[PDB]
Amino acid sequence: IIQAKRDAKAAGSYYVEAQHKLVFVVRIKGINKIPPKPRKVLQLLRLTRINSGTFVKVTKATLELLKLIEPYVAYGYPSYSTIRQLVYKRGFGKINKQRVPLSDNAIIEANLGKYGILSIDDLIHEIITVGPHFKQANNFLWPFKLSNPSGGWGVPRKFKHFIQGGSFGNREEFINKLVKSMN
Amino acid sequence: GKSHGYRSRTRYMFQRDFRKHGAVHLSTYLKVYKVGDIVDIKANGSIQKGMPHKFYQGKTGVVYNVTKSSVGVIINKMVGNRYLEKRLNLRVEHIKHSKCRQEFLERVKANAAKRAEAKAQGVAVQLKRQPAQPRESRIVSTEGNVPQTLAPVPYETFI
Amino acid sequence: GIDHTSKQHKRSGHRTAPKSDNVYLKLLVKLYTFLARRTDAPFNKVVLKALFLSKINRPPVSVSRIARALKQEGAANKTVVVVGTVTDDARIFEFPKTTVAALRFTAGARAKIVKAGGECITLDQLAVRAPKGQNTLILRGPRNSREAVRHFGMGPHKGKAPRILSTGRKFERARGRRRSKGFKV
Amino acid sequence: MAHFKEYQVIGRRLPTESVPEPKLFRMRIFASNEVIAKSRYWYFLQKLHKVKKASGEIVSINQINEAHPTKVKNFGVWVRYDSRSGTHNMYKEIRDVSRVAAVETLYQDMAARHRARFRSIHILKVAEIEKTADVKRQYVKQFLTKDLKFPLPHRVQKSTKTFSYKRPSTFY
Amino acid sequence: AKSKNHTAHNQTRKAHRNGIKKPKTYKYPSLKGVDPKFRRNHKHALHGTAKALAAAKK
RNA sequence: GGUUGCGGCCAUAUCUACCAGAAAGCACCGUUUCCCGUCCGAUCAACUGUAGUUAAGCUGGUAAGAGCCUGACCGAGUAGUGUAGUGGGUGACCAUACGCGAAACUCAGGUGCUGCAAUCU
RNA sequence: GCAGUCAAGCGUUCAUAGCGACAUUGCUUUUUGAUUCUUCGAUGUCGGCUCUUCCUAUCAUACCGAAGCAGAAUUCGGUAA
RNA sequence: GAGAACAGAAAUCUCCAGUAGAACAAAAGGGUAAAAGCCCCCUUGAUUUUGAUUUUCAGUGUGAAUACAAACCAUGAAAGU
RNA sequence: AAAUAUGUAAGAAGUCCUUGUUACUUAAUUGAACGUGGACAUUUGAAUGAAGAGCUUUUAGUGGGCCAUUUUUGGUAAGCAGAACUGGCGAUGCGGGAUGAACCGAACGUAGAGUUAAGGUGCCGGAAUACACGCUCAUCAGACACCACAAAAGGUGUUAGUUCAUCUAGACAGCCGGACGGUGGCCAUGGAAGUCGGAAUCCGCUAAGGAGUGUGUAACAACUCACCGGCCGAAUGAACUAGCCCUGAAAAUGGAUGGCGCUCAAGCGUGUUACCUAUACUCUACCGUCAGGGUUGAUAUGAUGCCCUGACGAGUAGGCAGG
RNA sequence: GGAAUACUGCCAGCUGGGACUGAGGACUGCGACGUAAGUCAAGGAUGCUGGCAUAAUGGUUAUAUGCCGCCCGUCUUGAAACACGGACCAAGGAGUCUAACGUCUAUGCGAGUGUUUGGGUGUAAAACCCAUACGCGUAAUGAAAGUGAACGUAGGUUGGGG
RNA sequence: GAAAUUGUUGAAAGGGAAGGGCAUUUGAUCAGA
Ligand SMILES: [K+]
Ligand SMILES: [Mg+2]
Ligand SMILES: [Mg+2]
Ligand SMILES: [Mg+2]
Ligand SMILES: [Mg+2]
Ligand SMILES: [Mg+2]
Ligand SMILES: [Mg+2]
Ligand SMILES: [Mg+2]
Ligand SMILES: [Mg+2]
Ligand SMILES: [Mg+2]
Ligand SMILES: [Mg+2]
Ligand SMILES: [Mg+2]
Ligand SMILES: [Mg+2]
Ligand SMILES: [Mg+2]
Ligand SMILES: [Mg+2]
Ligand SMILES: [Mg+2]
Ligand SMILES: [Mg+2]
Ligand SMILES: [Mg+2]
Ligand SMILES: [Mg+2]
Ligand SMILES: [Mg+2]
Ligand SMILES: [Mg+2]
Ligand SMILES: [Mg+2]
Ligand SMILES: [Mg+2]
Ligand SMILES: [Mg+2]
Ligand SMILES: [Mg+2]
Ligand SMILES: [Mg+2]
Ligand SMILES: [Mg+2]
Ligand SMILES: [Mg+2]
Ligand SMILES: [Mg+2]
Ligand SMILES: [Mg+2]
Ligand SMILES: [Mg+2]
Ligand SMILES: [Mg+2]
Ligand SMILES: [Mg+2]
Ligand SMILES: [Mg+2]
Ligand SMILES: [Mg+2]
Ligand SMILES: [Mg+2]
Ligand SMILES: [Mg+2]
Ligand SMILES: [Mg+2]
Ligand SMILES: [Mg+2]
Ligand SMILES: [Mg+2]
Ligand SMILES: [Mg+2]
Ligand SMILES: [Mg+2]
Ligand SMILES: [Mg+2]
């Protein structure tokens, strides 16, 4: 990617990077006073608690869900470091409807082995590169329960759009800093 | 007092699609409806017989009965907290074949053909539709397309 | 706070033990709990669940029903299992020789089976003979044949046996039951 | 909005089969980050051309650094802003070392003097006034006189302690 | 003393507490309103089909 | 390709004003004994295809034509509108953020296509 | 009920000394309405007498500004209860 | 709109234009042009049997209506209605 | 002719091929419906989710509602009266809005630690008399939505702008000089000479002077101003625009940015950090509930027992369960 | 022309100080280092040391201090209310029993079931035993006269636990 | 021989109520080892 940008600039063109295939969405609003459609979309994205986060593969169908729940979530494009730290520290699998910590590769192999995922790094790879079995890997991952940000939200008020000096909506690359401070 | 007749509030619903009044064209009567066919309900105001109630305007259902000049349509109506089966006897002027499944049937035939050609040529099917994906990387040239710089315009009235 | 998508602390809604205080039924429940846990045979699990059922959920299985089930193609030599009472039925004149395992047998049903040359065994005897339910045929009596059932769902145009103490002329038959008096239902 | 950076933003009005390689429009946007820069770019493109973010794409966003960040310059700034009862165009002159600093000063000054929030201000133009005597505002002209010196009377030194034992002085 | 006359307030919430359930479609649906001539002929057609299939099971 | 009978979509087909139409077809056209209907063989009915004509119908062309149809980075991302803020404003209302998104207007193009059967220089 | 803004006109001439149409912006709760929130296991329901205090949108008294203020008398207004 | 004795500005007769600007019992809305309007001809489907369905709705009743079935009829050349 | 909202479909109860039944239907094995047989499972034909789905019975209480945003009706309006969607209060504690049913934030088992929300950080009061750019002086300043009010119109107060003009060929202001002739221009008028009025807006000499900007007369006269000059010598004038402040701005016990108090604020607009703290989030412990499990192979006397795992915990009316 | 630095981001880079927690209780597992013995920060705290051995910790109680805290019950959209009852205390004080019933559950028997009207008997209102009836059920339907439930392996199709 | 209510003694606190919750100081008292 870096060399493609450099070569396009050298040739006098502009390298338009591929649109992001993955987002991380964190619910930043409480559970009270949510209209039914955004509340249902949050439930279907498994953000049923404030400071809970999930990975979403970007399509039109999920982009419209993000559009619906924008005033209640902060979402963006997670880096490899962010995904790795999330899975390593707060990674839990849904096994027999139970939240089991991913403390060993045997758990991941026993639950995602049929999809070719043998380890926690296989899981991280399937998340970052949206693979054929991204849906199964993401659903196996329990919704991440993050704390409040350690340095604060960086804004006086969370519940206006990130573009308007708030916290919600697409903060595309700054979601990494937010999630890292929240992790 | 209040007024809730059979055709109450149908003043614009049951109008005749301005400059499309008069006799119903013959394709409406030459249409053939079989049991199980999916039909959309749109009342023709010029045909007062066999007319659907205003609730069923724009509703899509399944034919369960075929009579001389009418079909029976099954509609699931939301009543309270559940759906009730309703059976309407509608003349063919108030219904048309639904295209809500023509795309599905054509996809079925195309999927069958693709599966056969796959099991003849190699191993690849990909028979599921996918949502619009994020765009891949592309290189945009400036040859004959040098970027033009725009600025916000000052205020003026021009009234 | 959590936006719950389902009711919290919801009980399963299924019995996990018999409501009965029968010590022998509790012993049978213990035996089939062990079998269901350590055999992986679906027969043991379904028998364990059936042992919990209430009386209206264990309708009697007649000997005629057992004979009809044994007339199934390939079931002539299967052990018939009835988690409940097996009753006699004089309407059938030819009973086949078979093994029936049941919670209880009516005197007449046991007499008919023995005279036909079979055996009436208890559920623990059935467990010993077939620990995995080998060659078994579970029979269930008709649940919706109950008197109470025909009154369920009573309402207009349901045809559902109004709850009545006396039956006959003058008893809920004139207005709302025929077109000559107001309307029919 | 915050400490400003300047970005060039070039967008495309995404190509079709009939019109490949569209006209690649460019803007210089002052914003605190790239998300806001792209948002402002799309806002002004929707004010100028028949296009929206869904029907277009961002081809390039590049931060533009000050060419000479350590050379003192006079900037002329043409802005358009919404007051409580109308829209007005204003020309102001700001002395600073960079376009971003001049724009930050402009936003602070508009907020202070006209209660104009960021949302109500459009930056029409920021251009360096190459030649003095083309500076037309006295509050900047007074800083361009030869050998300009001025004192700072009544100096107020901040005390690190609650109590002072000296009855301090404001000399400078 | 006058009172409130009507409101649909809280009615959707009440309906969605136990949810709006689709009406449990079955195969072989009822022939209640089907044309009685068609039903009469269908009975004989099904009788003949059953007899043919019984006779042809040799 | 023309024409006729039956048509499908039902103005790109309609409307106004002129012009043209070979062949065939259609048409106007000629007659009143019969069937039939009228105040009136005008309409309708019957008879002839003979006495005549393309005058009309009809078809096509023409018109900076009316209308109609289509398209538009034309107007206009405007009006409006879903969602958001402990935004502005005394208020009326307005701005901004994430989305959807007209109508009029303007310009450009076009003025029936087609199915079955029969027939024709 | 009280007070403003404009200013066609009244004021012999002259809009604004004093007024002021056609309009329009307000304030007050000493009018009367509107409502039915409190009180129906009970706030004693007119008026007068007595007495205290408060407000100012000031009648008089103090000091003033203005006048279609010569004096006298008066009118408008300010500080003022 | 253009024309004819009485006869004009309204009578009767004629032509042309006329998308409904009329009429269809009544209130309003919708619908309707070789018709649903006007005139004429024949008629009793405003009949019999008991079900199904739509609206109001509890998916009860009543009213109104829809589509069939089994008869007997009406009308038309007929399809049909 | 939108936006929002709304119906249907996205498969094995499907698709395809062959041909059996009928008293229906067709001119006709023609069609209709139901079939026998045969073929197609990695993606069985979009996304996301699914403390599972489906089903049944029987019963409590309720059947006065109210509030907020938005749409909206009547009304001048109402803390009025009536509707639509949603969220709430009722039924709900907790942190913030001083105070308050509804607002903001967040919903609650018992504790510890950390981080925050909304709101705040002069002192009361935990937290910067922080940083930065400006604006405001109020002899009724102002000080955070709901919310506890203020308007039209005004101000060489002060700040920032728009446009049009004058100016070293001398601008504005200031002081001094001229401010004429035809001409008492034409007309009612009793009188009207620039100056009560109707129309007419000329010409001359001009550096310049209106058939006159006002004072004045009964009319004159006499002063004055437009206009031009003399002096000075560099910027100036006008009409607008909108920020803060001020006038507009009057009620009754004495009192309320919550109070004190605050004036390059501790006010207003804006920006950046740091910091404070909820029963909210994260981790852990304990209690209970629910769910999924392991364990009769004995000394195992508590298999409704013991043990493992995960999640959850607000509550009036009311239901049930264990005590 | 060559760098540097800022800014942003990454490191399965190193490392200091502070606070809270120490649940579990033979082994089992996944790992790391080590050639291998074995060791370990690897499925939850151990090691060393000191003082005290009692009111010292702690509990209870009274008071003080900081912050918070309206009077319960009731009707109500809304109660601390300038809405009602309550001065105080003790004792009493309000969904009971019965006839006939619906659902559900437990028990006995089961096409049958119900001994207890009555009789026999008795250690005498108990317990024990019992005939014929009767009630309900095993047949419904019709106003009634009346009639009265297998074409079929008590049917076919679809799903169906086992 | 209860409570309401009361006397005496003892202890404690007390600027326009009292009572209560969390936390600890102080005084009194006390269990366990
Ligand atoms: K009262
Ligand atoms: Mg911190
Ligand atoms: Mg905040
Ligand atoms: Mg329409
Ligand atoms: Mg009719
Ligand atoms: Mg909880
Ligand atoms: Mg009511
Ligand atoms: Mg003729
Ligand atoms: Mg003819
Ligand atoms: Mg011709
Ligand atoms: Mg044209
Ligand atoms: Mg909100
Ligand atoms: Mg009293
Ligand atoms: Mg009193
Ligand atoms: Mg006064
Ligand atoms: Mg006709
Ligand atoms: Mg009616
Ligand atoms: Mg009531
Ligand atoms: Mg009311
Ligand atoms: Mg209540
Ligand atoms: Mg609440
Ligand atoms: Mg307040
Ligand atoms: Mg402090
Ligand atoms: Mg103003
Ligand atoms: Mg005069
Ligand atoms: Mg003021
Ligand atoms: Mg403060
Ligand atoms: Mg500030
Ligand atoms: Mg806690
Ligand atoms: Mg369990
Ligand atoms: Mg609870
Ligand atoms: Mg760095
Ligand atoms: Mg102590
Ligand atoms: Mg307090
Ligand atoms: Mg009340
Ligand atoms: Mg109360
Ligand atoms: Mg009160
Ligand atoms: Mg009372
Ligand atoms: Mg009392
Ligand atoms: Mg008592
Ligand atoms: Mg005594
Ligand atoms: Mg006592
Ligand atoms: Mg005292």
Coordinates of all heavy atoms in Angstrom, one line a residue, chain J residues 25 31 34 39 42 58 76 79-80 88 94-95 112 120 123 127 137-138 154:
Chain J
rG25 P -11.3 -24.8 47.8 OP1 -12.5 -25.7 47.7 OP2 -11.3 -23.8 48.9 O5' -10.1 -25.8 47.9 C5' -9.6 -26.6 46.9 C4' -8.1 -26.9 47.0 O4' -7.4 -25.7 47.1 C3' -7.8 -27.8 48.3 O3' -6.7 -28.6 48.0 C2' -7.4 -26.7 49.3 O2' -6.5 -27.2 50.3 C1' -6.6 -25.7 48.3 N9 -6.6 -24.4 48.8 C8 -7.6 -23.6 49.3 N7 -7.3 -22.4 49.7 C5 -5.9 -22.4 49.4 C6 -4.9 -21.3 49.6 O6 -5.1 -20.2 50.1 N1 -3.7 -21.7 49.2 C2 -3.4 -23.0 48.7 N2 -2.1 -23.2 48.4 N3 -4.2 -23.9 48.5 C4 -5.5 -23.6 48.9
rG31 P 1.0 -26.9 24.5 OP1 0.9 -27.1 23.1 OP2 1.7 -27.9 25.4 O5' 1.7 -25.5 24.8 C5' 3.1 -25.4 25.3 C4' 3.3 -24.2 26.0 O4' 2.7 -24.3 27.3 C3' 4.7 -23.8 26.3 O3' 5.4 -23.2 25.2 C2' 4.6 -23.0 27.5 O2' 4.3 -21.6 27.2 C1' 3.5 -23.6 28.3 N9 3.9 -24.5 29.3 C8 3.5 -25.9 29.4 N7 4.0 -26.5 30.4 C5 4.7 -25.5 31.1 C6 5.5 -25.6 32.2 O6 5.7 -26.6 33.0 N1 6.1 -24.4 32.6 C2 6.0 -23.2 31.8 N2 6.6 -22.2 32.3 N3 5.3 -23.2 30.7 C4 4.7 -24.3 30.4
rG34 P 17.3 -22.6 26.7 OP1 18.5 -21.9 26.3 OP2 16.3 -23.1 25.7 O5' 17.7 -23.8 27.6 C5' 18.6 -23.7 28.7 C4' 18.6 -24.8 29.6 O4' 17.3 -25.1 30.2 C3' 19.0 -26.2 29.0 O3' 20.4 -26.3 28.8 C2' 18.3 -27.2 30.0 O2' 19.1 -27.3 31.1 C1' 17.0 -26.5 30.3 N9 15.9 -26.9 29.4 C8 15.4 -26.1 28.4 N7 14.4 -26.7 27.8 C5 14.3 -28.0 28.4 C6 13.4 -29.1 28.2 O6 12.5 -29.2 27.4 N1 13.7 -30.1 29.1 C2 14.6 -30.1 30.1 N2 14.7 -31.2 30.9 N3 15.4 -29.1 30.3 C4 15.2 -28.0 29.5
rU39 P 12.4 -29.5 40.6 OP1 12.5 -29.6 42.1 OP2 11.2 -30.1 39.9 O5' 12.6 -28.0 40.2 C5' 13.8 -27.3 40.5 C4' 13.9 -26.1 39.7 O4' 14.2 -26.4 38.3 C3' 12.7 -25.2 39.6 O3' 12.6 -24.3 40.7 C2' 12.9 -24.5 38.3 O2' 13.8 -23.4 38.4 C1' 13.5 -25.5 37.4 N1 12.5 -26.3 36.6 C2 12.1 -25.7 35.4 O2 12.4 -24.6 35.1 N3 11.2 -26.4 34.7 C4 10.8 -27.7 35.0 O4 10.0 -28.3 34.3 C5 11.3 -28.3 36.2 C6 12.2 -27.6 36.9
rA42 P 2.6 -17.4 36.3 OP1 1.6 -16.4 35.8 OP2 2.5 -18.0 37.6 O5' 2.7 -18.5 35.2 C5' 2.2 -18.4 33.9 C4' 2.1 -19.7 33.2 O4' 3.4 -20.3 33.1 C3' 1.2 -20.7 33.9 O3' -0.2 -20.5 33.7 C2' 1.7 -22.0 33.4 O2' 1.3 -22.3 32.1 C1' 3.2 -21.7 33.3 N9 3.9 -22.1 34.6 C8 4.6 -21.2 35.4 N7 5.1 -21.8 36.5 C5 4.8 -23.1 36.3 C6 5.1 -24.2 37.1 N6 5.8 -24.2 38.2 N1 4.6 -25.4 36.7 C2 3.9 -25.5 35.5 N3 3.6 -24.5 34.7 C4 4.1 -23.3 35.2
rG58 P -10.3 -1.6 65.2 OP1 -10.5 -1.0 63.9 OP2 -10.4 -0.7 66.4 O5' -11.4 -2.8 65.5 C5' -11.7 -3.7 64.4 C4' -12.5 -4.8 64.9 O4' -11.9 -5.5 66.1 C3' -13.9 -4.5 65.5 O3' -14.8 -4.3 64.4 C2' -14.2 -5.6 66.4 O2' -14.6 -6.8 65.7 C1' -12.8 -5.9 67.0 N9 -12.6 -5.1 68.3 C8 -11.8 -4.1 68.4 N7 -11.8 -3.6 69.7 C5 -12.7 -4.4 70.3 C6 -13.2 -4.3 71.7 O6 -12.8 -3.6 72.6 N1 -14.1 -5.3 71.9 C2 -14.6 -6.3 71.0 N2 -15.5 -7.1 71.5 N3 -14.2 -6.3 69.8 C4 -13.3 -5.4 69.5
rU76 P -56.4 5.3 43.5 OP1 -57.3 4.7 42.5 OP2 -55.3 4.5 44.0 O5' -55.9 6.7 43.0 C5' -56.8 7.7 42.6 C4' -56.1 9.1 42.5 O4' -55.4 9.3 43.8 C3' -55.1 9.3 41.5 O3' -55.7 9.6 40.2 C2' -54.2 10.4 42.0 O2' -54.9 11.6 41.9 C1' -54.2 10.0 43.5 N1 -53.0 9.2 43.9 C2 -51.9 9.9 44.1 O2 -51.8 11.1 44.1 N3 -50.8 9.1 44.5 C4 -50.8 7.7 44.6 O4 -49.7 7.2 44.9 C5 -52.0 7.1 44.3 C6 -53.1 7.8 44.0
rA79 P -47.1 11.5 44.7 OP1 -45.7 10.9 45.1 OP2 -48.3 10.7 44.6 O5' -47.3 12.6 45.8 C5' -46.3 13.6 46.2 C4' -46.4 14.0 47.6 O4' -47.7 14.7 47.9 C3' -46.4 12.8 48.6 O3' -45.6 13.1 49.8 C2' -47.8 12.6 49.0 O2' -48.0 12.0 50.3 C1' -48.3 14.1 49.0 N9 -49.8 14.2 48.7 C8 -50.6 13.2 48.5 N7 -51.9 13.6 48.3 C5 -51.8 15.0 48.5 C6 -52.8 15.9 48.4 N6 -54.0 15.7 48.2 N1 -52.3 17.2 48.6 C2 -51.0 17.5 48.9 N3 -50.0 16.6 48.9 C4 -50.5 15.3 48.7
rA80 P -44.0 12.7 49.8 OP1 -43.4 13.2 48.6 OP2 -44.0 11.3 50.1 O5' -43.5 13.5 51.1 C5' -43.7 13.0 52.4 C4' -44.0 14.2 53.4 O4' -43.1 15.2 53.1 C3' -45.4 14.8 53.2 O3' -46.4 14.1 53.9 C2' -45.2 16.2 53.7 O2' -45.3 16.3 55.1 C1' -43.7 16.5 53.3 N9 -43.6 17.2 52.0 C8 -43.0 16.8 50.8 N7 -43.0 17.7 49.9 C5 -43.6 18.8 50.4 C6 -43.8 20.1 49.9 N6 -43.5 20.5 48.7 N1 -44.4 21.0 50.8 C2 -44.7 20.6 52.0 N3 -44.5 19.4 52.6 C4 -43.9 18.5 51.8
rC88 P -50.5 8.6 68.7 OP1 -49.6 8.3 67.6 OP2 -52.0 8.1 68.5 O5' -50.0 7.9 70.0 C5' -48.8 8.4 70.6 C4' -48.6 7.8 72.0 O4' -49.6 8.4 72.9 C3' -48.8 6.3 72.1 O3' -47.7 5.6 71.7 C2' -49.2 6.1 73.6 O2' -48.0 6.1 74.4 C1' -49.9 7.4 73.9 N1 -51.4 7.3 73.8 C2 -52.1 6.6 74.9 O2 -51.4 6.1 75.8 N3 -53.4 6.5 74.9 C4 -54.1 7.0 73.9 N4 -55.4 6.9 73.9 C5 -53.5 7.7 72.8 C6 -52.2 7.8 72.8
rA94 P -59.9 -10.9 62.8 OP1 -61.2 -11.6 63.3 OP2 -58.6 -11.4 63.5 O5' -59.8 -11.1 61.3 C5' -61.0 -11.4 60.5 C4' -61.2 -10.3 59.4 O4' -61.2 -9.0 60.0 C3' -60.1 -10.2 58.4 O3' -60.2 -11.2 57.4 C2' -60.3 -8.8 57.9 O2' -61.4 -8.7 57.0 C1' -60.7 -8.0 59.2 N9 -59.5 -7.4 59.8 C8 -58.6 -7.9 60.6 N7 -57.7 -7.1 61.0 C5 -58.0 -5.9 60.3 C6 -57.4 -4.7 60.3 N6 -56.3 -4.4 61.0 N1 -58.0 -3.7 59.5 C2 -59.1 -4.0 58.9 N3 -59.7 -5.2 58.8 C4 -59.1 -6.1 59.6
rG95 P -58.8 -11.8 56.8 OP1 -58.3 -12.8 57.8 OP2 -58.0 -10.8 56.3 O5' -59.4 -12.7 55.6 C5' -60.5 -13.5 55.7 C4' -60.9 -14.2 54.4 O4' -61.4 -13.2 53.4 C3' -59.8 -14.9 53.7 O3' -60.3 -16.1 53.0 C2' -59.3 -14.0 52.6 O2' -58.7 -14.5 51.5 C1' -60.6 -13.3 52.2 N9 -60.5 -12.0 51.6 C8 -61.1 -11.7 50.4 N7 -60.8 -10.4 50.0 C5 -60.1 -9.9 51.1 C6 -59.6 -8.6 51.3 O6 -59.7 -7.6 50.6 N1 -58.9 -8.5 52.5 C2 -58.8 -9.5 53.4 N2 -58.1 -9.2 54.5 N3 -59.3 -10.7 53.3 C4 -59.9 -10.9 52.1
rG112 P -64.9 -53.2 33.0 OP1 -63.8 -54.0 32.6 OP2 -66.3 -53.7 32.9 O5' -64.7 -52.6 34.5 C5' -63.4 -52.3 34.9 C4' -63.3 -50.8 35.2 O4' -64.3 -50.1 34.4 C3' -63.6 -50.3 36.6 O3' -62.5 -50.5 37.4 C2' -64.0 -48.8 36.4 O2' -62.8 -48.0 36.2 C1' -64.7 -48.9 35.0 N9 -66.2 -48.9 35.2 C8 -67.0 -50.0 35.1 N7 -68.3 -49.7 35.2 C5 -68.3 -48.3 35.5 C6 -69.3 -47.4 35.8 O6 -70.5 -47.6 35.8 N1 -68.9 -46.1 35.9 C2 -67.5 -45.7 35.9 N2 -67.3 -44.4 36.1 N3 -66.5 -46.5 35.6 C4 -67.0 -47.8 35.4
rG120 P -77.3 -55.2 61.4 OP1 -78.2 -56.1 62.1 OP2 -77.0 -53.9 61.9 O5' -75.9 -55.9 61.1 C5' -75.9 -57.3 60.6 C4' -74.5 -57.7 60.3 O4' -73.9 -56.8 59.4 C3' -73.5 -57.7 61.5 O3' -73.6 -58.8 62.3 C2' -72.2 -57.6 60.8 O2' -71.7 -58.8 60.3 C1' -72.5 -56.7 59.6 N9 -72.1 -55.3 59.8 C8 -73.0 -54.2 59.9 N7 -72.3 -53.1 60.1 C5 -71.0 -53.4 60.0 C6 -69.8 -52.7 60.1 O6 -69.6 -51.4 60.2 N1 -68.6 -53.5 59.9 C2 -68.6 -54.8 59.8 N2 -67.5 -55.5 59.7 N3 -69.7 -55.5 59.7 C4 -70.8 -54.8 59.8
rU123 P -65.1 -55.2 71.3 OP1 -64.2 -56.1 72.0 OP2 -66.6 -55.4 71.5 O5' -64.8 -53.7 71.8 C5' -64.5 -53.5 73.2 C4' -63.3 -52.5 73.2 O4' -62.1 -53.2 73.1 C3' -63.3 -51.4 72.1 O3' -62.9 -50.2 72.7 C2' -62.3 -51.9 71.1 O2' -61.7 -50.9 70.3 C1' -61.3 -52.6 72.0 N1 -60.5 -53.6 71.4 C2 -59.1 -53.5 71.4 O2 -58.6 -52.6 72.0 N3 -58.5 -54.5 70.8 C4 -59.0 -55.6 70.1 O4 -58.3 -56.4 69.6 C5 -60.4 -55.7 70.1 C6 -61.1 -54.7 70.7
rA127 P -62.7 -44.7 60.7 OP1 -62.1 -43.8 59.6 OP2 -64.1 -45.0 60.6 O5' -61.8 -46.0 60.7 C5' -60.5 -46.0 61.2 C4' -60.0 -47.3 61.6 O4' -60.6 -47.7 62.9 C3' -60.5 -48.5 60.7 O3' -59.6 -48.6 59.6 C2' -60.5 -49.7 61.6 O2' -59.2 -50.2 61.9 C1' -61.0 -49.0 62.9 N9 -62.4 -49.2 63.1 C8 -63.3 -48.1 63.2 N7 -64.6 -48.6 63.3 C5 -64.5 -49.9 63.4 C6 -65.4 -51.0 63.6 N6 -66.7 -50.7 63.7 N1 -65.0 -52.2 63.6 C2 -63.6 -52.5 63.4 N3 -62.7 -51.6 63.3 C4 -63.1 -50.3 63.3
rG137 P -71.7 -38.4 32.6 OP1 -71.4 -37.2 31.8 OP2 -73.0 -39.1 32.5 O5' -70.6 -39.5 32.2 C5' -69.2 -39.1 32.1 C4' -68.3 -40.3 31.9 O4' -68.4 -41.2 33.0 C3' -68.6 -41.2 30.7 O3' -68.2 -40.6 29.5 C2' -68.0 -42.5 31.1 O2' -66.6 -42.4 30.8 C1' -68.2 -42.6 32.6 N9 -69.4 -43.4 32.9 C8 -70.6 -42.9 33.3 N7 -71.5 -43.9 33.5 C5 -70.8 -45.1 33.2 C6 -71.2 -46.4 33.2 O6 -72.3 -46.9 33.6 N1 -70.1 -47.3 32.9 C2 -68.9 -46.8 32.5 N2 -68.0 -47.8 32.1 N3 -68.5 -45.6 32.4 C4 -69.5 -44.7 32.8
rU138 P -69.0 -41.0 28.1 OP1 -68.4 -40.2 27.0 OP2 -70.4 -40.8 28.4 O5' -68.7 -42.5 27.9 C5' -67.4 -42.9 27.6 C4' -67.3 -44.4 27.5 O4' -67.6 -45.1 28.7 C3' -68.2 -45.0 26.5 O3' -67.9 -44.9 25.1 C2' -68.3 -46.5 26.9 O2' -67.1 -47.2 26.5 C1' -68.3 -46.3 28.5 N1 -69.6 -46.3 29.0 C2 -70.2 -47.5 29.3 O2 -69.7 -48.5 29.1 N3 -71.5 -47.4 29.8 C4 -72.2 -46.2 30.1 O4 -73.3 -46.3 30.6 C5 -71.5 -45.0 29.8 C6 -70.3 -45.1 29.3
rA154 P -57.5 -53.1 10.9 OP1 -57.2 -53.3 12.3 OP2 -58.5 -54.0 10.3 O5' -58.1 -51.6 10.7 C5' -57.6 -50.5 11.5 C4' -58.1 -49.2 11.0 O4' -59.5 -49.1 11.2 C3' -57.5 -48.0 11.7 O3' -57.3 -46.9 10.7 C2' -58.6 -47.6 12.7 O2' -58.6 -46.2 13.1 C1' -59.8 -48.0 11.9 N9 -61.0 -48.2 12.7 C8 -62.3 -47.7 12.5 N7 -63.2 -48.1 13.3 C5 -62.5 -48.8 14.3 C6 -62.8 -49.4 15.5 N6 -64.1 -49.4 15.9 N1 -61.9 -50.1 16.2 C2 -60.6 -50.1 15.7 N3 -60.2 -49.5 14.6 C4 -61.1 -48.9 13.9

